[PDB]
Design a protein around this ligand. Structure first.
Ligand code: STI
Ligand code: FYH
Ligand code: CL
Length: 285
């Protein structure tokens, strides 16, 4: 099986024994994900397993990750799926999730230039997924990771029934993150790359505020109705007008009127080619 000679060969399949399983990750906030070590590489990894009908979504997540490779998407390193317990192994990201990272970070270090950089990296991963005709479905700061030198990667932790609190709430027989969810997704169950664009705009606001909770002090039962009547979050303090214009574009009612990720990414790279975000932020302020 493990030998290139076999018909049953999969390059992604690895030796379970090759990995030393340590403790659960982030105190359990990610479910059955464990810090690990790849012995031979002396490399920390993150290892997702199954806890005791649920097999095929896990195997399909494995299937999908084999299909995608981007600098800004968390990288599959291997699998153990020949026999239970099934593993999915990715790289481990030193600074953990972007949401907590934003709230806990030193702001002298994580300045406007670094925030812009973080938003840019995310838009590139999304450009890639756009181009490969994938949809993310739960784009948000809580689903991104941060490594060395402000490297940001887009992940998908499957958080809807793992996260405690009111982030995800019951809607349509399932748990939605209501404050990140595009109107057509809440109203008509319509999910697409353009509804990832809406969530990206909310993600952008999370970056701009250092991970404040969106629509702060607004009841969830009121979000759709406000949105339908053209309400949007106001420009965060310090936010350059152009970045806010970009947020406003992502939050078009009609999905078709939302920029594609390629255009979003193109705007980040253009927006400050001749003027620094630092000057704009200080101007705003
Ligand atoms: C261990 C593992 C197993 C699987 C995954 N998977 C993904 O992150 C992922 C990313 C993108 C897609 C693309 N996909 C397209 C289709 N739509 C519908 C879903 C998303 C799928 C899975 C990540 C991990 N990594 C992971 N998980 C939880 C926590 C951590 C972690 C925590 C702290 C520091 N370093 C790493 N790391
Ligand atoms: O950096 C800021 N905003 C911002 C917005 C968008 C943005 O672009 C992108 F693409 F989203 F990343 C980048 C940065 C910022 C926010 C609050 C306070 C201060 C400085 N002040 C310090 C003293 O106290 C008062 C505030 C700066
Ligand atoms: Cl998809």
């Amino acid at each position: 099986a493990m030998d290139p000679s076999s018909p049953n060969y999969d390059k992604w399949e690895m030796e379970r024994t090759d990995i030393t399983m340590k403790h659960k990750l982030g105190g359990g906030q990610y479910g059955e994900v464990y810090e690990g070590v790849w012995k031979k590489y002396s490399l920390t990894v993150a290892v997702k397993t199954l806890k005791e009908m649920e097999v095929e979504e896990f195997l399909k997540e494995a299937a999908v990750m084999k299909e995608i490779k981007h600098p800004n998407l968390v990288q599959l390193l291997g699998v153990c799926t020949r026999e239970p317990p099934f593993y999915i192994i990715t790289e481990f990201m030193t600074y953990g999730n972007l949401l907590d990272y934003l709230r806990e970070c030193n702001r002298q270090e994580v300045s406007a230039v670094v925030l812009l950089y973080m938003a840019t990296q995310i838009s590139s991963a999304m450009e890639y997924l756009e181009k490969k005709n994938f949809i993310h479905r739960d784009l948000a700061a809580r689903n991104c990771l941060v490594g060395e030198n402000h490297l940001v990667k887009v992940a998908d932790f499957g958080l809807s029934r793992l996260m405690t609190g009111d982030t995800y709430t019951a809607h349509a027989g399932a748990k939605f993150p209501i404050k990140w969810t595009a109107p057509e997704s809440l109203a008509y169950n319509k999910f697409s790359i353009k509804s990832d664009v809406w969530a990206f705009g909310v993600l952008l606001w999370e970056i701009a505020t250092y991970g404040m909770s969106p629509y702060p002090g607004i009841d969830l039962s009121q979000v759709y109705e406000l949105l339908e009547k053209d309400y949007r979050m106001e420009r965060p303090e310090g936010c350059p007008e152009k970045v806010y214009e970009l947020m406003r574009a992502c939050w078009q009612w009609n999905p078709s009127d939302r920029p594609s990720f390629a255009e979003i990414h193109q705007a980040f790279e253009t927006m400050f080619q001749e003027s620094s975000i630092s000057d704009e932020v200080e101007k705003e302020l």
